[PDB]
Amino acid sequence: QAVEDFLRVHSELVHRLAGDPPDELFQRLDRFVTDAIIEGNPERRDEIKADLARAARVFGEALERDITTPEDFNAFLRELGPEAVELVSTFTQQFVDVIRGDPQAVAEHLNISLEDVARLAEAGEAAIERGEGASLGVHRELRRIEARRNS
Ligand SMILES: [Cl-]
C-alpha cells in the first residue's frame, strides 16, 4: 500500500535522532525488513501491513513534536498509549530478527560481509537494551562499517 509513508518518516526520525546523515544503506535495509515482516506471514499480511500504518502515523506525529532524544520519543509513545508503545517495540525487535533470519540476504542487499551483518544485529540488540531502538543502533553501526571499508 502507501506504507512507504512509514519508511519515509521512519528514516527521517531515525537519522535525526542518531546524529547521522541520511544513508542509502539504511533505507535499503529498512525496506528489506518491512518486506520481510510482510512475507513472514502471508496468512496475516494485511494485519502486519496495517500495524505499519498505525506506526507510520506515530512517527509522523513524532516529527511534529519537540523530540530531540530517544527518551523524548519514548515519552511521546507513552502519551500515545500502549498500542503504539508495543507497536514500535514489536517492529524494532523484528528488525533484529529479520537480520538474523536471513544474514546472507542482508549481506546481498547491502554488499557487506556476513561479519558486518552480525555487527548490525549486535548493534541493534544493544540499542534496544539502551532504550534507543534497533534502527538507531543499526544506523550508527552502518557508518562505522562504511568507514572501515570505504575510507
Ligand atoms: Cl537514512
Query: Per residue, what are the HEC states of the chain?
Result: CCCHHHHHHHHHHHHHHHCCCCCHHHHHHHHHHHHHHHHCCHHHHHHHHHHHHHHHHHHHHHHHCCCCCHHHHHHHHHHHCHHHHHHHHHHHHHHHHHHHHCHHHHHHHHCCCHHHHHHHHHHHHHHHHCCCCHHHHHHHHHHHHHHHHCC
Region for 41 from its dihedrals, namely left if φ exceeds 0, alpha if ψ lies in -120 to 50, beta otherwise: beta
Estimate the crossing angle of helix 82-101 against helix 24-39, to 10 degrees: 100
Structural domains of the chain, count:
1
Q: How far apart are CA 136 and CA 87, in angstroms?
A: 16
Can you give the residue range of the structural domain that contains 94?
4-149
Give the technique used to solve this structure. Answer: X-ray
Q: How far apart are CA 51 and CA 57, in angstroms?
A: 10
Listed residue (106, 110, 122, 97) closest to 150, CA to CA: 110
Centre of ligand 1 from the C-alpha of residue 28, in Å: 9
Torsion of CA 11, 61, 92, 10, to 10 degrees: -10
Listed residue (67, 69, 60) closest to 132, CA to CA: 69
- Nominal resolution in Å? 1.8
Centre of ligand 1 from the C-alpha of residue 22, in Å: 4
